[PDB]
């Protein structure tokens, strides 16, 4: 998982994590406000050293209407079942391994994306 920034409710500033040294529980207090809200995630911070990220989260469906981009008829969609699909390599710079191809259904109101 991760942890987001949860903003103060009074000042809308950033809440820092702080241990309740009395009840022994994680809080989220503010710097400017005196706003103590009770944590739930028990996490301060994460850091994916692997830099493993799923590209399908970053691939946006609008890419299908890109004329610049190669179209296959060799991998059909799964939700609808369209034949047409654009495909491309991960445009993200973290790709020295990923010449893997990401496919997008070329059919409006679907935008189903998958990797084979």
């Amino acid at each position: 998982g991760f942890v987001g920034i949860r903003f103060c409710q009074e000042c809308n500033n950033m809440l820092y994590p702080k241990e309740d040294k009395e009840n022994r529980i994680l809080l989220y207090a503010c710097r400017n406000c005196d706003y103590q809200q009770e944590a739930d995630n028990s996490c301060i911070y994460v850091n994916k050293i692997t830099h493993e990220v799923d590209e399908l989260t970053q691939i946006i469906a609008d890419v299908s209407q890109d004329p610049t981009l190669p179209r296959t008829e060799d991998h059909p969609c799964q939700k609808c079942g369209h034949k047409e699909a654009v495909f491309f390599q991960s445009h993200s710079a973290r790709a020295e391994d990923a010449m893997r191809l990401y496919y997008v259904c070329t059919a409006p109101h679907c935008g189903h994306r998958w990797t084979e």
């Binding site: 610049t68 981009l69 190669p70 491309f88 390599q89």
Partner: protein, 50 residues
């Protein structure tokens, strides 16, 4: 020392499709000087000879 670089976004020239790593898409001139170069490979030849 490398093949023709993607100076357009993920492609060498607008005539090629994005992520076309194929031979002619990256500067492989397949004709001879007697056959004459295709215009794309003429431009890649110019890039190389520069």
């Amino acid at each position: 020392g490398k093949r023709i670089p993607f100076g357009f976004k993920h492609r060498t020239l607008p005539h090629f499709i994005k992520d076309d790593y194929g031979p002619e898409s990256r500067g492989f001139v397949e004709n001879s000087y007697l056959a004459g170069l295709t215009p794309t490979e003429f431009f890649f030849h110019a890039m190389g000879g520069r």
